[PDB]
Amino acid sequence: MHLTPEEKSAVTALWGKVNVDEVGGEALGRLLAVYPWTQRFFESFGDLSTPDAVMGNPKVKAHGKKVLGAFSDGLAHLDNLKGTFATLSELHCDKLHVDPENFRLLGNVLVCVLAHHFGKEFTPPVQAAYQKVVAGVANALAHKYH
Amino acid sequence: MHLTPEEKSAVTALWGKVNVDEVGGEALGRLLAVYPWTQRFFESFGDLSTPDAVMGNPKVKAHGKKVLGAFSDGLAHLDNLKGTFATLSELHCDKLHVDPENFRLLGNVLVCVLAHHFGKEFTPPVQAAYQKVVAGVANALAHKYH
Amino acid sequence: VLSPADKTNVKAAWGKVGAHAGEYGAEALERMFLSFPTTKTYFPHFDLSHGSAQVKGHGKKVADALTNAVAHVDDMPNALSALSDLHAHKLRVDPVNFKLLSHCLLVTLAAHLPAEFTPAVHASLDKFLASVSTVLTSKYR
Amino acid sequence: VLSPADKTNVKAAWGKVGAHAGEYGAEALERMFLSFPTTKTYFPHFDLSHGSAQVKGHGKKVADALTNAVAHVDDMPNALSALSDLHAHKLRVDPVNFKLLSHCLLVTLAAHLPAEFTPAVHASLDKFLASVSTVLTSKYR
Ligand code: HEM
Ligand code: HEM
Ligand code: HEM
Ligand code: HEM
């Protein structure tokens, strides 16, 4: 996590404009639809057969919001991601058995989502700050795997 | 490193039995033959048209010895690979323009050479500690890229 | 493999790119240089400064090639043969970097085509870039 | 694309494996589990302890499939249809993992077939495991 002060300000200024409810649902839905293999963890979510079925599924929307919720909290402790995410890392490993590569795919999808929403405001340099952040979060979420 | 005293001792003790001269030439040559695209940095070495030609090339064998040389000395600063490879990291970036991915290909080749050489001796637990060292080394070497 | 749906999606999204392909190509490069600095090792000879004409020039070349693969969506291996040879034999770009550029291309399109960058289209464009990448890397060994 | 030299090299090396493929299957899994602990996420239902019959059994299963692949080196896609299916629609193992088992498989052959694990044979086996990996993840999306 080599976030220069200016990189950190930029992450924070944009995150100010995000509707986590909204972004959360879009990022999760899009993951399930671009990398269908990731659907393996959600067979109790119901119908994920098409993008419409995925994007609109009330369960996916609700889970996305939860996920981004935890992510937002992360953004307030950019200094201590490992600490912030420790119990969550243990849970994903020990209970959910989620392959950490999943954390990197979601990060990329999230970046595309931010680009989708902010248009021209998601400048090359802002993307680079967010790339460091999604990677820092994925690493923090994988730190307790064993 | 995140090596266990037990893991440190296993690394350390096998290394003691290594002929860097021979392992160095074989690791680098295997690299050039399995992943032919790594040859882009060694045009001045000559003919690498065949495995035979690669494995026989003295320029290769000699470069291989230089590389394991440096690696070998890094095994003595296992608690600060970053600090040990700082200048080598800048060099690789700024002068040589070597993509850090190459460091990971070599690491894996290195491990195959060790297994090749030590058979029985190179047990799952021992490979595990070596995998952590090669990753650690590659990360250290890539640390100064910008 | 790309399905009829995929093909339709791609031709559609790429259709919208039209005349901006060049600029989107340059933008994808810059994003890539900034987010994945290791990719820079392949352009030691380039001026990578913001607004570099070398980057502009290069962005266009990449965009023309993608435009060419869309025009020949049913015969990409052949449509891209030459580029596949160049990359395998001269440039020798490590395979992992294709995924990085692909990613930056997707961000760029997302940033420019909000109405078209639907979940369905996103999925199709991702499979497409993956296929282009596969072709360009096919003759590596 | 496997060249004829490659197909030869592979068949030779695998030829020497013989009645030990199962043990080598098992050993490669054990090495994967220890070196890349993230791979264990796919086997929560297994006893991953050393010498576990679950691991041994699975080791045989994998080895057998490789055999069948060497045997149909010319028609992999067809010889592995079912397996491609299973992985794409049921197991849904993330593609990065294939590279990890392939590597632990080389390491294992190397440690067991010294004379045979020449540089040229090493190159061939790698390509082969790569193609096998491609086949198994081809119907993912
Ligand atoms: C930014 C990365 C992520 C964060 C911050 C995150 C956060 C969370 C949180 C806060 C929960 C609920 C905890 C609980 O149930 O006590 C959860 C559960 C879960 N997460 Fe993650 N998650 C992330 C990524 C992922 C990904 C990428 C996947 C799968 C591809 C995943 C799979 C799951 C599953 C399957 C559950 C349990 C759902 C249920 O209640 O059945 N997570 N996650
Ligand atoms: C284990 C990881 C590596 C280590 C410790 C390492 C170390 C070294 C050292 C000590 C030198 C001597 C140069 C000097 O001091 O001026 C060198 C040079 C060089 N290395 Fe690396 N290296 C590593 C990996 C690689 C890889 C994987 C490649 C490319 C496949 C590479 C390409 C080169 C080249 C092209 C040179 C310059 C040799 C010359 O001047 O002809 N290195 N390296
Ligand atoms: C789908 C992705 C890609 C496409 C369509 C593409 C296409 C092209 C084209 C059309 C050219 C110019 C050839 C000419 O001179 O006529 C080129 C050159 C080049 N590409 Fe690729 N490429 C791709 C991926 C990559 C990646 C990922 C890298 C490295 C990060 C890369 C590095 C290069 C380099 C170094 C050159 C030579 C540039 C020069 O010296 O002018 N390419 N590529
Ligand atoms: C080299 C490529 C691979 C081959 C040839 C292969 C082959 C097989 C075979 C033959 C089976 C058993 C089918 C049956 O039960 O009838 C299987 C199942 C399975 N494979 Fe794959 N596999 C490969 C890669 C992987 C990887 C890398 C992973 C995960 C890290 C994996 C995860 C699984 C799992 C979880 C099962 C089911 C285990 C069980 O519940 O019994 N496979 N594979």
Domain assignments of chain A as residue spans, ordered by start = 1-146
* Rg of chain D in Å (alpha carbons): 14
Ligand nearest the Cα of residue C129 is 3
Q: Give the three-class secondary structure for C73.
A: coil
**Cβ atoms of B37 and B5 closer than 8 Å:** no
How many angstroms separate the CA atoms of C129 and C109, rounded?
Answer: 12
In 3D, which of B71, B38, B63, B67 has the Cα closest to residue B137? B71
Cα-based distances in Å from B86 to B144, C80, C89: 7, 41, 32
**Cβ atoms of B16 and B76 closer than 8 Å:** no
**Cβ atoms of C27 and C108 closer than 8 Å:** yes
Partner chains of C (3+ C-beta pairs under 8 Å): A, B, D
Q: Which parts of chain B are beta strand (E)? A: none
Helix, strand, coil abundance in chain C, percent, nearest 5: 75, 0, 25
How many angstroms separate the CA atoms of D45 and D63, rounded?
Answer: 20
**Cβ atoms of C113 and C16 closer than 8 Å:** yes
Report whether C87 belongs to an annotated binding site: yes
How many angstroms separate the CA atoms of D1 and D127, rounded?
Answer: 8
> D42 CA to middle of ligand 2, Å?
38
How distant is the Cα of B103 from the closest Cα of chain C, in angstroms?
Answer: 12
**Cβ atoms of C91 and C136 closer than 8 Å:** no
Q: Which residues of D contribute to the annotated binding site for heme b? A: 87
**Cβ atoms of C137 and C98 closer than 8 Å:** yes
Q: Which parts of chain D are beta strand (E)? A: none
In 3D, which of C124, C133, C134 has the Cα closest to residue C8? C124
Chain A residues in contact with D33 by the CB 8 A cut-off are none
In 3D, which of A27, A64, A124 has the Cα closest to residue C111? A124
Q: Sign of the CA dihedral C136, A114, A31, C4?
A: negative
Q: What angle do CA C76, C81, C84 make, to 5 degrees?
A: 105
Output the 3-class SS for chain D: CCCHHHHHHHHHHHHHHHHHHHHHHHHHHHHHHHHCHHHHHHCCCCCCCCCCHHHHHHHHHHHHHHHHHHHCCCCHHHHCHHHHHHHHHHHCCCCHHHHHHHHHHHHHHHHHCCCCCCHHHHHHHHHHHHHHHHHHCCCCC
Looking at CATH, the fold of the domain delimited by B1-146 is given as Globin-like (1.10.490)
Mention every residue, 6+ apart, whose C-beta is less than 8 A from residue C60: C21, C22, C25, C26
Contact residues, D window 70-89, toward A, CB-based 8 Å cutoff: 88
Chain B residues in contact with C37 by the CB 8 A cut-off are 145-146
C38 burial via Cβ count (<10 Å: 0-12, 13-18, 19+): buried
**Cβ atoms of B63 and B121 closer than 8 Å:** no
Of B99, B142, B145, the CB nearest to C94: B99
DSSP secondary-structure letter at B97? -
Ligand nearest the Cα of residue C87 is 3
This structure was determined by: X-ray
Where helices occur in chain A by DSSP H, the ranges are: 5-15, 20-34, 51-56, 58-74, 81-84, 86-91, 101-118, 124-142
How many angstroms separate the CA atoms of D54 and D72, rounded?
Answer: 27
Residue C140's φ and ψ, nearest 5 degrees, are -65, -35
How many angstroms separate the CA atoms of D110 and A23, rounded?
Answer: 49
DSSP secondary-structure letter at D101? H
Paired tokens of D48: 């991953």
Chain C residues in contact with D138 by the CB 8 A cut-off are 1
Please tell me the residue having the least CA distance from ligand 2 atom 24. Answer: B103
**What angle separates helix D96-112 from helix B101-118, to the nearest 10 degrees?**
30
How many angstroms separate the CA atoms of D134 and D84, rounded?
Answer: 9
How many angstroms separate the CA atoms of A130 and A13, rounded?
Answer: 12
Domains present along chain D, CATH in parentheses: 1-141 (1.10.490.10)
Paired tokens of B145: 């890229």
Answer yes or no: do B37 and C92 touch at CB < 8 A: yes
**C45 in contact with chain B, both atoms CB, cutoff 8 A:** no
Cα atoms in the Cβ-side hemisphere of radius 13 Å centred on A108:
20
In 3D, which of D102, D133, D121 has the Cα closest to residue D13? D121
How many angstroms separate the CA atoms of D103 and D84, rounded?
Answer: 20
Of C123, C127, C141, the CB nearest to D127: C141
How distant is the Cα of D140 from the closest Cα of chain C, in angstroms?
Answer: 10
**Cβ atoms of C122 and C110 closer than 8 Å:** yes
Paired tokens of B91: 């060099």
